[PDB]
Structures are given as C-alpha cells and as structure tokens.
Symmetry: D3
Subunit: 298 residues, 6 copies
C-alpha cells in the first residue's frame, strides 16, 4: 500500500525544546530514500502547522500544559491523516512528541471496526490531568485516545473513544506513575514491561502480541516512541530511562510485525536532534522503519 | 520484615584502596530513600569499625594478607548481624570487599537449620591460603564459610561450618583458579558460569536456582558482588572481568528472587568509588536492591 | 544599541543537511534570554524564507551549486538586514551556512563609508566558480562580497563590492585552497592563520586586528563561522578542521572586541545540530555572543 | 591435535590498509601463550609472503581488484596449509582480509570427502565479478570456494570446487548484496541472519548448525570474520555493520563448537589494528580462539 | 618545614554528597608517598570529626544552610591547625568543601601580622546570607574570613577578620554572582579572572601575584579549589564551570609558587570522588601538591 | 633536497610489542603522498631487517636488554643512512622505538663537523646500564650517541662520539630519572622541560633553540619521539606522560624549523598502532612531517 508521510513538528506536549526538529532529522536520516528502495509509492505531505503557546500564567493549564495549541495541532493532524486513509494510503506520522498520537489515532480509528494499538514505549502515556505528575500532555495520549482525559483531547475528530483497552498492547515499559499502574490494571490493558521482555524474550512477546491482536482487531496502529529503546541506542529523547530494549530486539520486533502484515498505520516519535549524538536516534528510527516496511537480511 | 543496614568499610580483604568507601557511596546513591519508598521500616546501624593492617613483614601469612584485622572486623560484623536477626529484622550489609561475607554469614547462619547461599559473582571466592594465587582474603570467604581455610576465618562467631556445599549456588562465574575449580567440583557446589547463563538464559538459571534452594533450605542469603555484572555496567570494582551479566539480567534476577520470597539476608559488596565513573556502580547496587526488595514496573 | 535577530535556515550553500536547523538550535540554546540579561532591547524578526533546489542535472550550476535559490534567499536577507540598520538597530544574523554572509554584508555595507570585516573561520571562503574545488557557495561569500564571483552573487542588493580587501582580517585559518592562497596574497588581505595565532598568541592577534581596522573603517562586521573553533569544542559543523582555536581563545577574542566597541553587525554560522553532540556547538555560539555583547567575569 | 599457525598479511582483497597487520596484532594479543596454556603443541610457521599489486590501469579487471597478487598469495597459502594437514596438524590461519579463505580452503578441502564450512560473518562473501558492487575479492571467497567466480580464484590448488553448498552454514549475516541473496537462495545455502539469531537465540542456532553439519560432513572448517561481531565489540574491521553478534554469543558459539569437536581447521580474519582501539579486536579474536580450542570456565 | 596533613570530611557547606570523601580519595591518590619522596617529614593527623546537620525546618537560616554544624566543625579545624603552626609545622588541609577555609584561616591567621591569601578558584566565595543565591556556606568562606557574614562564621577562633582585602588575590575566576562582583570591586580585592589569564598568560599572572603579596605580607596561604581547573581536567567537583585553567597552567602556577617560597599553609578542596572519573581529580590535586612542595622536572 | 625513507621495525629497545608496526602505520597514514604533494623527490628504501632477541637468561645484561639484536639492527641502519647521505639525499627514518636513534646518528654524524640534535621528547633518553631503571635501550640512545654507555652501542658505525653535549637541545621533557638529571646537568646539555615551555611559550623556546644551534652547528638532526606530545594527542606510545605538548605547539615547532631551514635529517619514533586509537598517533606524525617539510597554511 502506498505510503504518505506527515511530519508533525510538535514540542508543546512536553518541555524540552528540539523535539519539533524530529520530522526533519528523520527526513535527513533518509526516510524517503529508504522506503523508495523497498519499491514503495512514497509521498511526503510535509508538516502540520503547529501554533505557539501563550504565557503559562496567562493561560488555562498547568496540569494540562499548552492544551489549546496541542488540541488544535491535533485537530489538524487528525484531518490530514483521515484524508490519507480515505485515499487508501498508509499514514506514516513523524514526530514530534507523543501527544501527536491523539491526532493520528483520531484520523485513523474512525476507519476501523476494532483498531488495535501497539505502544512501543518506556512509559505508559496513560495519565490524566488528575494523575499526571508533570502536566505534560505527551504523557496522556494513550489515555486520551481510550476516552479518558480532558474533552479537548478526547473529542479530537469529533468522536470517542478511538480504541478499546482490550485492543491495546504496551511493550517495553519500565516507568509508570502510580495512577498509570492503577489505570492499566483496572482497564485490563495488556502490558509487557521490561520484566516480561527479560523473562520471556522479545520473540515470545512479539508472537503473543501479534496473535492477541490479530485475533480481535481489523487494523493495528504502531505507536513507537524512541524512548522505548535503551538510551545507549537512542540517546536523543527527552524522557530517557535506562535498561531499555536493544537495537536488535527492536529490529526483530519490526521484522516480526512486517512478517505478520498487521500494521495498518504507524508513527515514530520523540526524536530530538538537540539531545542526540550526531542524529543517531533519527537514524535508528529510519532503520526501524526499513524493517517495519519489509526489509529482509536474507 | 524491617530492614537494618550495616556498613562495613573494609578494604583489607584485597589490595586496591577505595572499596572501603563502598558503604557510603551506596548511601549517597540513595539506598535509604529507595527502600523507604517501598514502605519499609528501614534503620541504618552505621559502620563496623575496621582496624588497620599490621606491618606487612611481621604479618602472619603472605598467603593470608591482613588476617588478624580481617578476622577482627568480621567478629564485630558477625555480632552486629546476629543482633539484627535476633531483633527480627532483615540484615542488609553494605561493603566493603567480599571478605566481609565471612562475618555476615557468621551472624546469620546460626539462626537457620539449613541456610542456602546465592553467590552472584564473577569469581568463586573458594580459595584457601594453599590455593590462593594472591593471598587476598576477599577471594576466600565462601570456602571459609563452608569450613575450609584458616581457623581464624572458619571459626568466626564460634562455630563452623556456616553452610553446606549442597546449599550453595554460584551465578555469573567467569574466572576460577584451578584449585577453585577442583574445590567446586569435589564439594559438588551447584554453579552457573557465563556459559550456562549464555546457553540457558537468565530466566532458566534463576528458576532452577530458586527451586533448588527452596527445596532444601530454610533461609537464603544473597551475597552479591558487583563484579558479577559486566565492567561496562559496573566499572567500579577491583577485580573486573569482561563478558559479564547485564544490567537487565541482574534486575530480572532480583525481581525473580523478590517474587520467590526466599531471600532472608543480603549483602552488596566490592563497590569502589575510586575506580568508578560518577558513582555508577553504587547506583547499580541501589537499583538492584530496589528490585530485590519489591519494586515492580507494573 | 537595540538588537534584531534574523534567522536564516540555509543549507543550500553546501551539501550536508541540518545546518538549516542552526538558527533554532541557537534559539533553543537561549540566545534571547542571554542577551536580555545584558539589558538589551532584543527583538527576534524570525526566519528568512528559503526556497528549495531544483534537480542538479535539470539546473544551472555544479561549480555554483544551488545558485538561484542561494541568490534569492540572499536578496531577502539583504533586505531584512538593510531595514534593521535603517531602524538604527544592530543586525544579529543566525545561520545557516556561510553563504548567507553575502546577504548580510549586502544589507549592511551600503550604510558605511568603509565597512571592515573580521572573518573568524578555519577557511578563507574566497573561492570563485573557477577556483572552487567543491562548487559549494558557502566557500565563496567573502570573495563574492569583495566583488569577485558570479554576478548573481556579487550584485545582491544592487551594488558591489560591499567591502575592500584592505578592510578584511581573516582569523583562525588553517585550510585554504591554492586559488584562495593566491587570492589572499594578491588582494593583500590581512590574515592570521593558526601559525600566527600559535606564534603570536590570541591577545596580540586581536590587539593588532582591532587597531588595524579601528584605524581605517567606520564600522566592523563580525562574520563568525563555528568551524573556526577546534572540532573538540565545536563538533557540529560540516567542514571541521583539527588544530583550531580553543573555547577560551574565542571568549578572549569576543571580550576584546566588546571592549573595543568596534563591532556594528554580526553573524554566527554553520551550526549544524545534526552533526553535533547535544547542541554543544549552538551553546558555544550563544556563550560567544554573550561575551561579544558585553558579558564580563569581573 | 597439534596446531600450526600461519599468518597471512593480506590487504589486497580490499582497499583499507592495515588489515595486513592483523596476524601480528593477534600474535601480540598473545595467541601462542593462550594456546600453549591449553597444553597444545603449538607451532608458528610464520607468514606467507604477499606480493604488491600491479598498476590498476594495467590490471585485467576492475571487478576483480588485485587478482594476480591475491591469486598468487593464495596459491602459497594453499600449499602451506596442505602441508600442515599432511603433517597431521590443525591449520590455524591468521589474517589478513577474508580473501585468504580461498587459499585456506584450497589446502584443506582436498583432504576431506565432504568438508563443511561455518562462515561466521556479517556478510555473505558470495559475490562474483558480475555481482560484486565493489570489485573487492574479500567479498568473493565463499562463492569462489564453491566453484563460482574467476578461474584464477576457483582453481587455486588445481581443483574445484572445494566445498558443496549443502555443507555451508552462514551465521551472523546482516549485509547481503542482491546478487548474493539470489546466490544463497538458489544454491540452497543454510543461513542464519541476525533475524534468526535474534529470533531463535544463539544456543539454538549453534545446536542446529552443529547437528546439520555433523550429520553430513567429515570435517568442518571455521572461517571467522571479526566483522561478524558488533562493531562495539570488534571495532577493528574494514566493513563494520551495526546490530551484530555480542562478545558473549561469540564465546558461547566457540564453546559449543569445542564441545562438539567438529572443527578441523580454522581462520580468524579481517583484524585491522589501524581501525581499532588499543588492539581490542585482536584480543577478542585470541579470546575466541581460546574458547574454540577448549577453555572452560568451570 | 615538616608537614602535618589534616583531613576535613566536610560536605555540609553545599548540597552534593560525596565531597566528604575528598580527604581519603587524595590519601588513596598517594599524597603521603608523594611528599615523603620530596624528603619531607610528613605527618597525617587524621580527620576532623564532622557533625550531622539538624532538621532544616528547625534550622535558623535558609540563607545559611547547616550553619551550626559548619561552624562547629570549623572551630575544631581551627584548633587543630593552630596547634600544627604552634609546633612549627606547615598545615596541609585536605577537604571537603570550601567552607573549611574558614577554619583553616582561623587557625593560621592569628600567627601572622599580615597573612596573604591566593584563592585559586572558578568562583569568588565572597557571598553573605544576603548576597548568596544558594545559601551554601562553601560560597562564603572568603568573605567570612575577611570579616563579612554571619558572626558564627566570622568569629571562628575568637577573632576577626583573619585577613585584609588588600592581601587577597583571586585567580581563575569565571563565575561571580552580582553581589560578589560588587564586593570584590568595593573591597578592592585583586582578581585575575579567566579574561586576564587568557590575556596576560599564567606566567605573568603568577609573577604579578607573587610580587604583589611578597611585597606586603609575612605569610601566604594557598586555598586551592579544584573547580579552578577546567572540568575536563578536574571533573570531580560539585560546581564545575567550563573554560577553566589547564593541567599545565596549574602545575606552572604551583612551580612558580614553590620557586618563590612564599606559601606558608595550604588546602586543597572540593574533591568529590562520587562525581569523578576513576579518582582523576584527587590525582590532579596530589600532583599539584607535588609541584607546590618542590618537585622539579629538571 | 630529495628524501629517502627508511623504516626500522624495531621493538627490542623496550618491552611493549607493536612499536615495530610504527613504520607501516605511518606509511598507511600517507607519509609518501603527503610529501609528494610538497613536490619532493621522495623514495622509500623499505625496512631494515631486525633480528629476534636471544634467550633472556643467556642474554648479556638485564641492564641492557636485547643488546646484541639492538646493536646489530643499528649497524644496518647506520649503513643505510650513511649511503642516503652520501647520495645527497635527506634521510627520514621511521621507527620503531627510540633505540634506532643510535643507528640514525651513526650514519649521519660522520658527515658533519658539528652535528646538532633536537630531542623532542617527554624523557631524556640519557641513561646507561648503570643509571637505567629498566634496562630498556630505548632510554639510552642520546647518552650512547654522546659516547656514554656500552661500547656495542657507542661504537656503532666505528666512531664516537657522534655529537657533543653543547650541540644538543632537549624539548618537552617531563620525566627524567635521577641519574639523567645529573647527566644533563653535568654534561651541560641545553634543556627545555614542560616548565620552560609553560613559562616561556613554544615560540620563545623554538626561537632560542634555533638560534643556539644555528650559531654553532653545521647540520641539525631532529629526533622526534611521539611521546613528546600529550597522550591525549598521541595515545599510541609505550611510555606516555601527561601534561605534554599540544598538537598546535608541535605544528608550530615544525613550522619554525621548516622556516629556519636547519634540519638536515629526521626521525619520527615510538608510534605503536597497538596502543593507539584508529592510527591517531601515526597520523599526527605524518601531519608533523608535512609541516617540517614545508607545508604552509597561508
Ligand atoms: N511520551 C513520553 N515521553 N512520555 C513520558 C511521560 C513521563 C511521565 N509518565 C509523565 O506523565 O510525565
Ligand atoms: N527486568 C527489568 N529490567 N526490571 C527493571 C527494574 C528496575 C527497577 N527495579 C524499577 O522498578 O525501575
Ligand atoms: N571478592 C573478590 N573480588 N574476589 C576476587 C578473587 C580473585 C582471585 N580468585 C583471588 O583469589 O585472588
Ligand atoms: N559463555 C561465555 N561467555 N564464555 C566465556 C569464556 C571466555 C574464555 N574462554 C575464558 O575461559 O575466559
Ligand atoms: N563556510 C565554510 N564552511 N566553508 C568551507 C569551504 C571549504 C573549501 N575551501 C571549499 O571551498 O569547498
Ligand atoms: N601552527 C599550526 N597549528 N599549523 C598547522 C599546520 C598543519 C599542516 N601542516 C597543514 O598545513 O594543514
Ligand atoms: N570479507 C569481507 N569483509 N567482505 C565484505 C563484503 C562486502 C560486500 N558484500 C562486497 O562484496 O564488497
Ligand atoms: N534482526 C535484526 N537485527 N535485523 C536487522 C535488520 C536491519 C535492516 N532491516 C537491514 O536490512 O539492514
Ligand atoms: N566553593 C565553591 N564551590 N563555591 C561555589 C559558589 C557558587 C555560588 N557563588 C554560591 O555562592 O552558591
Ligand atoms: N576569557 C574568557 N575565557 N572568558 C569567558 C567568559 C564567558 C562568559 N562571557 C561568562 O561571563 O560566563
Ligand atoms: N624512548 C623512550 N620512550 N624512552 C623512555 C625512557 C623511560 C625511562 N627513562 C627508561 O630509561 O626506561
Ligand atoms: N610546568 C609543568 N607542566 N610542570 C609539570 C610538573 C609535574 C610534576 N611536578 C612532576 O614533577 O612530574
Ligand atoms: Mn511515549
Ligand atoms: Mn566476590
Ligand atoms: Mn566559513
Ligand atoms: Mn568476511
Ligand atoms: Mn571555592
Ligand atoms: Mn624517546
């Protein structure tokens, strides 16, 4: 299926500047060339216009920092993504902090009976203004997409929820806030923390994830945060957490997903050139995209 | 069970200075705060007074360097540990070189009918003055505790042996002197070298270890030497050996032990701030203690 | 004098992508905050719109790569800069590759009888299509400003030359093409290569430079390329050359310039976040700007 | 079986200078002492004389760089190796780029009815002048030994082919040219790329490899290219590819081979001191040789 | 003159733990052997007992963190130092944060009519509770010794001030708070910031410093903070500031002081093993002490 | 004057293996191409055959390790060098440990009435079997050439001494054994240790050196040991000593020598690829040769 790339230069979901340079860092890491080689009809729809944040003290949210600008940028993204899907193309969203997942899922979910989600990440991203310890919206996209959070976030695209808890699989988690542990536990979300990855191995984790979703969804969205990889492999992220997934485990994951042919949309986020070492993180993302989209060693 | 921390600023078991700073390096890495967060009644009983070495020339044996100071400090440690156990508290000993294991086991073992031991280490520590290639007592604590070695060491606490060979499990070993291989083989001590870790995987090694001990001991003492981890993960040790256990394998091990609820005493040793990089090793030790004591990602 | 910042996201002057992210990397390194603290009336006029390059094979220049887009972007910059000067403000241009110096000098020079230039750089940037070994325009701005090169470049702003050879001082040079050595020699341009910096010392080099220009110009433009600093101090540049000026020599230079009060316009260029280590180079630039604009240790 | 070491200071199989220093870098890393310690009768037959290449423009094929010199040096190697085998000794060849495998296999194969080969490498080394993207002969030894390529290479030792496709096992591959993928696929060569190693685990890949070959060969030659290991473990190679085999996986592999007792000849190649960090790569090779030849941790 | 070493395991002058390990890190870096080699009668009087701080909320001033404990420990130090001077020995104090200078100067100054001070540091350490931006007493010792600050600090040893402004020389300064710049300016304290060191050169700064003090004091105390050196040379400090003095400049400084024979007491402070790389900073301090005490290359 | 390169793969003057790879490490760093570019008639006469060391036990002196092999290789070198000089060519010797200086000076000195020597090094190399703390001949070449030492070394080439003490200038020294300090002092050899370099500056040291020699010699031999540079700039040496000459000071020195036109022979020694980082040291040596032989930045 033809691919359409949409860059979302978003950093309002968190406080570290530079993550808005992620889309172009990845473009410069050769994302187009990489995919063209796989003989794909690849189109780059450019970047979503992101607005600026007003004085924190002058406006609305500390438990929900930059809510208006984040909700507006996400409305735009949701529309762009909805259109690509309508054109029968695969939407490949390049971030940008994880708050953009709200817009991506808003544009995709409407097109599926039961959209599944694989959240490849070191965190849960299931906080609400009530549970968030930072007020950073990039830590709330999954919860918001499940229909939990501020209506400005849960209603993007004009509907909610975008997905169901039983159709979500978290992989690589190693940092959850107490409220999130409760959320995950209570909503019954399938989660493979680093304990399970270490204990079962990435092959088994992926086999189970693929079988679980394939068995109950009609589409699967891959939401990959580079912080899911160990900081030694992906240093250019704002919220690094040691003891993460390796470069190889990640390529294996992408290769098994490609093999399964279940991924119908994807986004690579949190690439921050300014916290990186010579674009290493953007390069890992592009390599991972190569695997996801069909590259084979043999 | 409430925890009592006992620091043992010992460096007389070997020749590299600085390992006596281990206890405070770990305190500075936040060992108390870390454990308090797990809702533990944690108490820090301070440090065991360690004496200074006698004239190297007038000293008893080059095969048993600093024997008297080491045996004396170990008598004190054994008494302090014995008391904690008698008070119904879990003794958490922070070293200090591995020779302090002699004192820790002397204070604990008397309270169990069949105390088991998990020796997480890159070496065997089962040398005697006859087999030791260095004369360093930190390479003899396991043998001494099994009743093999100089009486000044084997009789600490007034009894011997502290444990039986069939109740010991070595994990992560990758450097054994010939006499130690003979000792292990002949005493029939269960051992998982890096070959078995690489071949079987940490999960299986831990499962087997836990089941083996759970099946025949009434208490288990964890004796963890930071040199058991790869020098890239724990550079601050006096006897580093490449090709070691990773950060994740070590957390998995601690998590599986926590889950099993078999650890009744523990000690983290050989942290040397002076051979380290910004307290990285003390930090790893504290993180490992967090997993051992119940932290869960989910 | 009030400062007006103009970002020029230019990378068409050379081939390494990412240098177009320099303006924002510096903004993120805190350029505004830094200058505001010096109690300056600082204004950020945003970025100059840069056009895209057409197929190399489809258009005009290999000895003059991206000539049209480079000349057009420079016309825009020249206008923006001209306006700031007319408003009686100091133009502070943030790049972007060095080809933007063509536009900056085009906007400034018209306002001075004898504008002097200090070219802080590892190279000479005095090539023409005839002498250029790469066809990269970022290696021709000085020559073009002196009136030597393609008319599309020498006539920006509608006049030429912008400056005279006798009013130019090169500092930190350690890589000159043969044609450039001839150019410098023949035009009689004052140059302090690393040999002179090593031999005389930065204090003497700066004293002489300041006295030389102060004695014959009515304004001095500082054109600072980060590659002038050693790659160990400023790794984020496309054309690094070892054995460069140190962090301290650079701050000394800026401090002596501030003291002299001869700098009437300035530009910091070649900052490339994508070839950098955690924004180190953008940070050095901002620190250097702090010194240039008056910061004092005492 | 006694061992005879043969150094082959070859760099003509590729373009990076320095790989000719590999034999001595390994000698300096202690290859002799390491093996003597295992109680081996070890003999160092010195180095095979390598000639200098003729003028490239006067050379016969650009798709076959340095063909004459490489074929010549290979004839000499084949003779020396043939002799060692005839003397009832194990030939241990130290390189030198991988093109020397042509000579090693030429001297060995003639002595076996069905010689098996384990190609521990990141590449396939199955190119021909037609498929080679570089013209570097170090990327053609496996194909040449299988009887595919220039006769100057396929006829070394006066016979062909040296081995059959069904007796070859590639391990650690992560970089194959299209022509090579077709070659491997069509010749039906057993291959375990990083996908399989990641998916199945080294233990299983080795068990299967050993069982497969043991079941159909009368001798097995190990041709180990240090680039098979991750560049972080073995940086001193001319063709590094990230996402490689770890230090531990490699020792496990060697240990399982030693255990199986199937290796009848071996060669360690591509060590380049000039692209290395303090002889790290030569040291790894020597340590792997120690495992291959019988070292045991327990 | 015989030397008496006094360790002061102090970290209460600031907030980073570990600087209390400085005295022993330097002992382990070989301070005694180094000095014995210079044929000195060296004596190690051990460490000054430091108390623990009282509850912050129950403390008297947040602008003066740990005031009681710091003042107490300083009284003890002053007494020990006073005693060494009375015995006709040179007091060599090892820290420990810079707040200990209050105690060192208190024990020394009383023995001189006009004690001079050389403050080798990146900061001024001339803050008061009013000007301090942190409330950390390690940033107030110079002012306190000059008689400016809380009486608990200014009256240590029972007298004040210990020294006069005209007898103080600051070298290597590159970080002064506004209040401190005003203080230095108004008290007329001689200061050589990095600008002067860069501009004049270390040789000239030292010649002038030595001549200035030699001309008006009857004793000179060297108070050397390792943060005065660049963080690349001395990473183990709590308040690092880039663009510092080099390893060579520091040895030159010590060598010129030794040559001048004006140093009558000294202290090396802020060494923090826990923020260091393999005891590098403690080693630098010891090497500098070797130069200060007479080592000569020729 | 045409240049003739003579490689001397010598490591018998010391104990660390690998320095014998120095000549080719430098050839691989492009020494020929570098000099050809300067329009030199450059000829590479290959390498001097070096013999293997005798049984350590049956060897002549532990105070003169490998004396016979070292003296023999030096006889050969002296002859090869003597010939080059007789052919009117400049002898450029590449080492190899510093003991080869004995042979280089033996072949050159006979052709001058008063040959001067510039010993660019971190050590003095003026030990004898009596003063040597190691027995390593690479620490005795200067003394031997001055006629002090074992006759097997002092009589190479059949005459002695090769040079006079008043015609020698040591630069960069920072490590002298006591006997060497006495030797230097008593023979009245001109020496600029790091103290003088730090105090006077490289420019002044070079000016003085050049004038001193120019005023009394008819030829000057440059004997440059890479250990003269700081280990951070030249890590690939067997006897590194911190606090050395920088990359720039070394280029300045070479440039001033080139300018003076006094160097009539030269040798670059102690490059050890095996203790280096990606051939960095050989690269520095080649760059230095480029400056020595006339390269100019301007
Ligand atoms: N997309 C991310 N990087 N999320 C990190 C979230 C961290 C933390 N749970 C928070 O809510 O602040
Ligand atoms: N299997 C693992 N890698 N576990 C990591 C656990 C780390 C630590 N105990 C935490 O809770 O953050
Ligand atoms: N606890 C330790 N670090 N032990 C290291 C022992 C090393 C060696 N086996 C010895 O006996 O000397
Ligand atoms: N499975 C492993 N990691 N084995 C490591 C063995 C290394 C080497 N053969 C030794 O005996 O030291
Ligand atoms: N602004 C620059 N970085 N210029 C580098 C120019 C390098 C070289 N002289 C060229 O013309 O290609
Ligand atoms: N004084 C200096 N740093 N000179 C550097 C010269 C480097 C080299 N000879 C060149 O021409 O590029
Ligand atoms: N032995 C090697 N390093 N081979 C690398 C081969 C790389 C590539 N397949 C080629 O044929 O050029
Ligand atoms: N299992 C793995 N590690 N696979 C790595 C594949 C990397 C990438 N897709 C390639 O073809 O180069
Ligand atoms: N001894 C020191 N490290 N002093 C640092 C002082 C920093 C700052 N001027 C303060 O008063 O907080
Ligand atoms: N000569 C120097 N190195 N000056 C450094 C000054 C740095 C900067 N202007 C500051 O005030 O922090
Ligand atoms: N060329 C050298 N690297 N010489 C080092 C000499 C070191 C010491 N002075 C010795 O005589 O052993
Ligand atoms: N000016 C210098 N850099 N001197 C370095 C001297 C270092 C030390 N005192 C020694 O004798 O080794
Ligand atoms: Mn996320
Ligand atoms: Mn141990
Ligand atoms: Mn430039
Ligand atoms: Mn290969
Ligand atoms: Mn201070
Ligand atoms: Mn030397």
């Amino acid at each position: 299926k033809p691919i359409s790339i949409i860059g979302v230069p978003m950093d309002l979901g968190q406080t570290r500047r530079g993550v808005d340079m992620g889309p172009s860092a990845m473009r410069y890491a050769g994302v187009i060339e990489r995919l063209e080689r796989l003989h794909y009809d690849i189109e780059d729809l450019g970047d979503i216009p992101i607005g600026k944040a007003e004085r924190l003290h002058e406006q609305g949210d500390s438990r929900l920092r930059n809510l208006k600008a984040v909700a507006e940028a996400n409305e735009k993204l949701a529309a762009a993504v909805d259109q690509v899907v309508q054109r029968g193309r695969f939407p490949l969203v390049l971030g940008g902090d994880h708050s953009i997942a709200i817009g991506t899922l808003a544009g995709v979910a409407k097109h599926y009976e039961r959209l599944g989600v694989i959240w490849y990440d070191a965190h849960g991203d299931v906080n609400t203004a009530e549970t968030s310890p930072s007020g950073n919206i990039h830590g709330m996209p999954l919860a918001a997409s499940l229909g939990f959070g501020h209506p400005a976030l849960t209603q993007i695209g004009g509907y909610s929820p975008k997905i169901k808890p039983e159709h979500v699989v978290l992989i690589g988690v190693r940092s959850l806030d107490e409220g999130e542990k409760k959320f995950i536990r209570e909503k019954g979300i399938k989660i493979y923390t680093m304990h399970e990855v270490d204990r079962l191995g990435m092959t088994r984790v992926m086999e189970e994830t693929i079988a679980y979703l394939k068995e109950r969804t009609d589409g699967v969205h891959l939401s990959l945060d580079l912080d899911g990889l160990d900081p030694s492999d992906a240093p250019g992220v704002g919220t690094p957490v040691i003891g993460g997934l390796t470069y190889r485990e990640s390529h294996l994951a992408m290769e098994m997903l490609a093999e399964a042919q279940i991924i119908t949309s994807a986004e690579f986020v949190e690439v921050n050139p300014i916290l990186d070492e010579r674009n290493k993180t953007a390069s890992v993302a592009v390599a991972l995209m190569g695997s996801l989209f069909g590259e084979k060693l043999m």
